[PDB]
A paper describes a structure:
Wild-type HsMCD (residues 40–491, corresponding to the mature mitochondrial form) failed to crystallize. The structure of the E58A/K59A/E278A/E279A/K280A quintuple mutant was determined by single isomorphous replacement with anomalous scattering and refined at 2.8 Å resolution. The mutant exhibited similar oligomeric and enzymatic properties as wild-type HsMCD. HsMCD is a tetramer in solution based on gel filtration chromatography and analytical ultracentrifugation (AUC) studies, consistent with the reported oligomerization state of many purified MCD enzymes. The HsMCD crystal structure shows that the tetramer is made of a dimer of dimers. A tight dimer of HsMCD is formed by extensive contacts of the helical domains of the two monomers, and the αD and αE helical inserts of the two monomers interact with each other in this dimer interface. Two HsMCD dimers then associate with each other through their catalytic domains, at ∼60° angle for the planes of the two dimers, to form the tetramer with 222 symmetry. Using HsMCD as example, we postulate that MCD proceeds through the formation of the tautomerized enolate intermediate, with the Ser329 and His423 dyad adopting important catalytic roles consistent with our docking and kinetic analysis.
Malonyl-coenzyme A decarboxylase (MCD) is found from bacteria to humans, has important roles in regulating fatty acid metabolism and food intake, and is an attractive target for drug discovery. The MCD monomer contains an N-terminal helical domain involved in oligomerization and a C-terminal catalytic domain. Unexpectedly, the MCD catalytic domain is structurally homologous to those of the GCN5-related N-acetyltransferase superfamily, especially the curacin A polyketide synthase catalytic module, with a conserved His-Ser/Thr dyad important for catalysis. The catalytic domain of MCD contains a central eight-stranded, mostly antiparallel β sheet (β1–β8) that is surrounded by at least 11 α helices (α1–α11).
Numbering used by the authors:
A (entry chain A): -9 to -1, 40 to 59, 66 to 114, 117 to 275, 282 to 343, 372 to 488
B (entry chain B): -2 to -1, 40 to 274, 282 to 343, 373 to 487
């Protein structure tokens, strides 16, 4: 009754709120504020999913005009340099979706870019909850990811350090947006910003003291093989290695703007300024989705599927027996298991893109509830050899090659 | 010869459609070589040769565009999948993005990168003005670059800073030096312009605080000012009107990024926050190019010689030239057009912003530049905030100039 009125309103608002595309000939000569107002007044994520789905599908590209312009370019190929360029630009203009003009005019508003980050955070969520589907919403994602990638480029971000002198609103923000290894109490947070620890974040030049992405570094004497050893440690007031034990994205709307890739790049330069005799850099990273992949394969060795759900770690006989098998299955999950030719694991793909080496597989590195249920206690060290991060980054993105240690490659030699 | 080899190894290559999201590792080092070689170019003619080659050589791959255009049309003859078409459309969309855009993008990420690109557009504009570079390829590259600069220097990315005698003297020097309207005489004059009954505001980029891009000088008075010497040469110890007596830009590379339009918008909001009972806003703007236009018409021989500073000395000549020069000024502002819009650049600026050609002031600037520039004449472009929106629309859209009865009477005389 009042539901069919909510649906009717969206279609009217998108018509009168989405700015119109002018003719290519006249492309040189309040609507957006109505959109922001209506979008704000949407309570549930399912409501917002309905509006985003209609915007993507209804206000994209005029597929008809694109074909007319595509043929118009091919008709000239059978005149003049300026004649060709004008027809190319006609097609370039025809390929610009009508919603892009809305996102562009919204940015020009007070707190406009902030709104758009929230709107892509919701769009990515609605896609994850399968509330929105289709290639139209996927295109609208890329258009937004593209615009945001220009506003939040490396050169518009400031590197800020978190100490116990930082505001508690910033420490709360950093504590809350910490899904890797959650913070237990305020005394734990004080330790993670305390001596032998370095906590860094990126803020936009526009919004200082607002974390966009967070990186936790531990100053140690060896490449760490255990997370408990880092998080549950009381260091006093010489360092050989810098271990990245946690990397977190605060704004989910900026998922894919390479914020973490530039964060590590920056922090290393900062740590090299502070310790000019520091040449060991590595991560101690979780292997999320491993247990899920392992249980997904297991579809009597039925005892295995059942047991692999936290409680199995209690038996010393079962853990000891599962060392060599789970480590060779992990080595394959990281090195051999692919997705679109690239590494199946999202964390491994992240570090391999950055030029890291799949250096070590650590048994019972995270004996926490999330550590055992997530990656069966296993963690890995993606080692950063600064002298070769460049070529490794290139070899992975370009030729889809994973550089791995002899330890890791031996475990894959055991498999297959 | 070096330019062709350098550009081939300094302009980052177009990544595969599949890897269009990832920053290549060499792309930083490639763009730093460009900045280094560009810096080492002495004359503008050298820089013009490099920019001309970049535009022409590193634009769009015209061959791949035709392959993608045909590929889309092959998918039209046969009603294919929705996602199949969209991917083919996006490949064509990607094929239409020029290779130099990736250089400008990767240069920005560099330390002092956006600063370099502002200088590079300042040079590109100059080389075009000196006809060192020509063609539609350099025109496209200036649009690509201006487009990027118009996003980085958007109101959201700018800070509104206020200048008081508490500001660093490096900022006051920068602001004194930036004066492109009514030059500052001494440090005591500058102290007055930031002093009581005066508001000085500027825009700095969020990346570079305390570095002015655009400056606006406001005078807090009891009436709409009719004389500039009454403002600049005054020792102040209730305010009715806010008079904008000077607006200055500091970067030629940001020519067309609409900074002055956003400063007036933001300064008014700031003035209203300070003074909620303030409803009178106007400018006291000069009329530059008027004397030049007037002398240009005179080609009646005595006035062509006399109109060059010294004529103001005779009280009989000034008194006689009061009613004629004001009616010729009224026409120069209201009737004289350029591409249908106001001939005067200052008048076009304020009318775009939604101002009204409110008053023509006789002997408002009796300075050497004031008499030689606009024959002592100045004008008040009044901002009626309740109607700035429709006035802005009427001027840009229908090319209509809203004027006062005083101004329209002088055009009725003409």
């Amino acid at each position: 009754g009042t539901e069919n009125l909510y649906f009717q309103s969206m279609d009217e608002l998108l018509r009168r709120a989405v700015p119109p595309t002018p003719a290519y000939e006249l492309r040189a000569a309040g609507q957006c504020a109505d959109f922001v107002s209506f979008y704000g007044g949407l309570a549930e994520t399912a409501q917002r999913a309905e509006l985003l789905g209609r915007l993507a599908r209804g206000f994209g590209v005029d597929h008809g005009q694109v074909a007319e312009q595509s043929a118009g370019v091919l008709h000239l190929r059978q005149r003049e340099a300026a004649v060709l360029l004008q027809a190319e630009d006609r097609l370039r203009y025809a390929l610009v979706p009508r919603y892009r003009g809305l996102f562009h005019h919204i940015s020009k508003l007070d707190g406009g870019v902030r709104f758009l980050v929230q709107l892509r955070a919701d769009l990515l969520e609605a896609q994850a909850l399968k509330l929105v589907e289709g290639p139209d919403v996927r295109e609208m994602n890329g258009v937004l990811k593209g615009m945001l990638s220009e506003w939040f480029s490396s050169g518009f971000l400031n590197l800020e350090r978190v100490t116990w002198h930082s505001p508690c609103e910033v420490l709360q923000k950093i504590s809350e947006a910490e899904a890797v290894h959650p913070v237990k109490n305020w005394m734990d947070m004080k330790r993670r910003v305390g001596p032998y620890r370095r906590c860094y974040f990126f803020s936009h030049c526009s919004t200082p003291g607002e974390p966009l992405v967070v990186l936790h570094v531990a100053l140690t004497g060896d490449i760490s093989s255990n997370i408990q050893a880092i998080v549950k440690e009381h260091p006093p007031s010489k360092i050989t290695a810098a271990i990245f034990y946690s990397i977190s994205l605060t704004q989910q709307g900026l998922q894919g703007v390479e914020l973490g890739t530039f964060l590590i790049k920056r922090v290393v330069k900062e740590l090299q300024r502070e310790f000019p005799h520091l040449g060991v850099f590595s991560s101690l990273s979780p292997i999320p989705g491993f247990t899920k992949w392992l249980l997904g394969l297991l579809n009597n060795e039925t005892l295995k599927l059942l047991l692999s759900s936290s409680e199995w770690v209690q038996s010393e006989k079962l853990v000891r027996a599962l060392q060599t098998p789970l480590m060779r299955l992990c080595a394959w999950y990281l090195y051999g298991e692919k997705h679109r030719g690239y590494a199946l694991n999202p964390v491994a793909n992240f570090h391999l893109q950055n030029g890291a080496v799949l250096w070590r597989i650590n048994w019972m590195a995270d004996v926490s509830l999330r550590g055992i249920t997530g990656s069966c206690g296993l963690m890995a060290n993606y080692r950063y050899f600064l002298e070769e991060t460049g070529p490794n980054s290139t070899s992975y993105l370009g030729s889809k090659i994973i550089k791995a240690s002899e330890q890791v490659l031996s475990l894959v030699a055991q498999f297959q």
